[PDB]
Point group: D3
């Protein structure tokens, strides 16, 4: 099935939200295909945020993204990239509904605790960048037929 990349940013990790963020995705029926705590290099984060190299916040973003470890995840399921964006809430948490991750945990756009892919095609690009193919796990979910038709 469809895959998406979710990262918990350094604020999400330092504020003790790894478990609740993973729960909201487990509880929904999505399957965890990859998971790691990493400290990525600035090259790696410049590639990840390449489409923002242009902008004027990009050096602030990169340097904050360097400021502690990150949890990189792949989640798998029907329409998981789009349903991921709904679970995380609006990029700006002040614009996010309660019951979303940013709606329950975040205030500032620059401490929005989580990153998610904005498309299927950008997800494949982010998964290939953060994970070697061997880190992707191939298993069937114990409750696949209770979750899907």
């Amino acid at each position: 099935d469809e895959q998406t990349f979710i990262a918990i940013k350094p604020d999400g990790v330092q504020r003790g939200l790894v478990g609740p963020i993973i729960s909201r995705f487990e509880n929904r029926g999505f399957k965890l295909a990859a998971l790691k705590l990493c400290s990525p290099s600035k090259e790696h984060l410049e590639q990840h945020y390449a489409d923002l190299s242009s902008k004027p916040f990009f050096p602030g973003l990169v340097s904050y993204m360097l400021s502690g470890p990150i949890v990189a995840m792949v989640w798998e399921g029907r329409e998981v990239v789009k349903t991921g964006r709904t679970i995380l809430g609006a990029t700006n948490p002040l614009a996010s509904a309660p019951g979303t991750i940013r709606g329950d945990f975040a205030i500032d756009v620059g401490r929005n605790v989580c990153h998610g892919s904005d498309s299927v095609e950008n997800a494949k690009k982010e998964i290939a960048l953060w994970f070697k193919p061997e880190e992707l796990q191939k298993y069937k979910h114990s409750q696949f037929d209770w979750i899907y038709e």
Copy 2:
């Protein structure tokens, strides 16, 4: 006060969601008038979904509704039927908001963990079909005066 019918579907029961769905109705202030785990007959489920005899998904819907036990319930309170639907969410989970049962727990419309009355009319019927008078409980909620004016 007004009554609505809510069923945890086989997927809901088989995924350990019986407690969490009861909690969401209890916590709102709604009163638990009737409750059981049951295995309805093909005939019963065909009567329950009567308005959909027409349609091409109707046989497969019936079979899945037989595929494992169902928790049938009656919740009583001011506009419980309408609020009942808001809590469950849109019948398609991907249209559903986080905060709602389908938005927290479900992906596919064929596995949307819960059925709810579409109206006060249908609620009165679905209650009669699923429950004998002996089984509808008559008691005043301990906290009625704190919940209503």
Copy 3:
């Protein structure tokens, strides 16, 4: 596998503890084999506590157990009667046991939120008393092989 009878007493139902109590057993991996909200007769309750028919507690214990509706349950799994008691906690909710149901929710031995069989023998007896054979559901937990060796 083995069975136990558990009932949420009328204090339990009126304090909104049905959801949380069901969750505790669900999450441990016990199977819900029966469930009903019912208002027993007095002879029913008399025969349920028949061992304490003489003892002085009896007529007061009985009148309280009539004060509102009760959730009767059957739970199924390995050693579920003994693990059932561990989860409820000691009869006197000054259990000395936070993490149990009584140790988290209760104070008074006469308002101790739930009843649990003292024994496999007494459970088989109590299950026969409270439930018709039809009400005992026969199905396989979706996750049996991940819960048992």
Copy 4:
């Protein structure tokens, strides 16, 4: 940074929602600036609801707001008055999204468990009314730099 006034109304307190309401604001990363259990005078409550002295519900509102003790709170953070409004949810609980305090806990407008200020200017007046300056705690939030940018 911006302050807002939240009160848990007597129904909130009597239903055991103090803990859960406090946790929703904590989890977002708002700073608890002030807190107390108090029973305000009829005269206090009438000045609090001054701009509704002319409305037909006013006399019931005041008597209800006198029917038991209130938890008064000051929460501090970026856009906390507006965000506080979203967290509490619509004044009428039946117009409220699940995932808001009223959306999860309340049914009737006359028992909507919680009060929040309608504006920054309004909140300043409500804080002045309910707390003397010595009850407002000044301190930096341990996680300030992970919450804000």
Copy 5:
């Protein structure tokens, strides 16, 4: 009924544990009689610690006990003083059971998130020291008859 004194220490407040700690007392069926966020002087702690000022250590303790705000609480019910100590867990978190506040949240004895009275006569001395008589609220718990016989 009987009263005990429970304080959340500044580690408790700065780690966001006010809501959870209040819930464990609310859910057990104890009645909040007083609540306030305060910053006491090294006078209003001098005699509070008339049993705990001069060990071997406490240039560390009194420095830390005004490192931040304290949430001060009175809780009311049958045996609230011994039950309170049970809920808080052992003074040293590393000898506390999971299910206790300290067992779920603390590590160091010097950051044990919580203080509670050591006896019923100590409670009264600790209550009259932290609270004026007009801060203690007097009201009947909503569920008194479901909590107590």
Copy 6:
């Protein structure tokens, strides 16, 4: 001071990753390392090398191949022993309500988690399952609020 924690295939398949992780975050222990991996049987044979002689070994290794495992390093004062208290007894039936096995498991062979038995044990399990690049060196934001 470090300890090794592994969510077993059953723990993953029953959706307990988030819950187990929070029970450690909440206590104030720091997450030094985390990954979802499928170890070789040779990896697992070395992990359980102390039970190489025991009857149930091939069946343990076989079961532990039946899907991915979440491997974790948690850091903090007395984290191996407090790690053991949080997990509960190896037999979930002998386990306190409030512990991970006390809340979520029944059979010893489906006990959702593995903890180090010792500081010494932990050091060997960490060295086996993670390379030193993967152990994250950082100060906990709330360190001074957790420890004297």
